[PDB]
Write a protein that binds this ligand. Sequence first.
Ligand SMILES: CCCCCCCCCCCCCCCC(=O)O
Ligand SMILES: C[N+](C)(C)CCO
Ligand SMILES: [Mg+2]
Length: 253
Amino acid sequence: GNPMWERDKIIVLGHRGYMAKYPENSLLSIRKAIEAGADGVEIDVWLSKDNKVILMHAETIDRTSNLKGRQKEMTLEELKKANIGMGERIPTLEEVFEILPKDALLNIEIKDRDAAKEVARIVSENNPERVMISSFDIEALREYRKYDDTTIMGLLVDKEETVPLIPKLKEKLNLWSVNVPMEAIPIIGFEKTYQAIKWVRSLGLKIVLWTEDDKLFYVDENLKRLLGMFEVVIANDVERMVSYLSSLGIRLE
Ligand SMILES: CCCCCCCCCCCCCCCC(=O)O
Ligand SMILES: C[N+](C)(C)CCO
Ligand SMILES: [Mg+2]
């Protein structure tokens, strides 16, 4: 009974804010996602050397910023000194919560199990009902659960051998959703993916769809064939997704 995530309307989140058009995991992309009609955003977080929760997808700042290094081995002053595009600086999770509408949804993907303690603290101060914690790393989710056992939680899946484990993980972690990549459709096949989703849903789990390439939502009408079987879609191109779902007559802009 979390009304922020349990809705009749499909939820659209911007991937890394809105990485199709604005610098990924930046405060600029977040505001733009919301103005384009997203319900919220998904971000990636790590813990800096001096114990601050910062936003970054990769384990080094190489690729999105003009500098080099591993953020887990750097401090926040060193990091706010990078440019991640369009003048934007690496934000902290606290900055993210100041920028967002107080009712906007936020999916925090924990990339760093060491960040779990601080993420749970910051979240408890910023209206946890609108937060989803997710991770590929079961031990990050288990650690998060030491500090917060009520926030909505999704398991990110990227390996086939994780799927049979889901009923026990749901128990151990109190999962709300399994967060599935559209890449599963080519890689394991549409029908096997469909039956796996159907089985997960029969366990009482909700479904979050994501992808590294929005083309996979639309090719072979992959997403349309899954209508009724997902609650949340994480899109790199928010405007395109918002328009598509309105064009099917299922989600009003
Ligand atoms: C409801 C669960 C069923 C779905 C199981 C699918 C398992 C994943 C297999 C494909 C992984 C592809 C991930 C590529 C993108 C990435 O890792 O960033
Ligand atoms: C970023 N996601 C939450 C969509 C999964 C990892 O790439
Ligand atoms: Mg992510």
